[PDB]
Amino acid sequence: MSQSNRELVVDFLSYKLSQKGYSWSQFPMAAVKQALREAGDEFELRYRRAFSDLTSQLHITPGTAYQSFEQVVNELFRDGVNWGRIVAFFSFGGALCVESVDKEMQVLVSRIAAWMATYLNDHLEPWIQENGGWDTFVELYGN
Template sequence: MAATAVFSSPAMHRLCSSLESSVDSPTTQRRELKYECQSIAHFCIYNKLKTHPLAQAGSLAIPPVGQISPSMHRVAKVVQRVAGEVEKRYNTQFNDMCCKLRLTTTTAYATFAAVANEMFSSGVNWGRIAALFAFVTSLAWSLTERGHIGVVERMPDWVAQFVEKNVGEWIASKGSWNAFVQEFERKCPDEITYDIENTDCGLTKLNIATLFGLLIATAFLTK
């Protein structure tokens, strides 16, 4: 009886409510989202660079992806696939943009964030988030070509920092990464390409012209 009285007391109810609130608090959600973004970015970068000729020759040491949950592994695979379709579609533009960027240890994140901010300057949707990861993997490849693997290792943190600060609330409001999976997981490449260019979940105004605008913007960043 005493135990029942304790667990049914108003004080215990307040304690339980407090604990439940802390678990689902905005701070906790942001922390989880930041970790998820780090994991997804690391997964995408790792799987992109393991196909690099230097990696194939055993001359490139790529930090492996840490252990992630099965659900996050599923998310990361879908993000990688969709980002890959975006990168394939805009390969020339991304390559040109990445080649123009001159990243130093002091300006690296600020330069990355300036380009990423431009991608979301007229709104947020899943297609633009996929484009962000496409940019990240393109940039990782370009930096590896220039011998800056140390900078590449920091990129998952850049993505997490940018997403948490700029688009994290939007992602959470849409149902987090599960919504991305539901939108794209079962679609073939042609359907993904159509969606990222022509629907509300896609790039919409972030088209070829805007990507060339990004190239012009990054040209100023390199001077």
């Protein structure tokens, strides 16, 4: 569902910005949020590169349009959707927000959240609903 997914993005990015010492101002669900926060932390511990290729492939400016974001995020899903790649997506968004703030383009982090919502609702929800919904995500990743 569209509205839950906006909340979920904003939670994950607010969590990452907080965690890495940044402002988050420029913006059962609680189980899904906790599980997703933990999943992103584990993911980033294993893979440390922070999607440096994908982020420079994107080359994000305020002139950058959703279609460009979409093209680059599709790289994560060249072999289709799985749970791991959904976590990577949330982690990629987080890395982009960090980059945006470091480059003094705080304006992009609310735009990135909207892009992530649209992309999640459009390309990922169809697979999530097929494979047991966010209940399955929690079953799989949650404490």
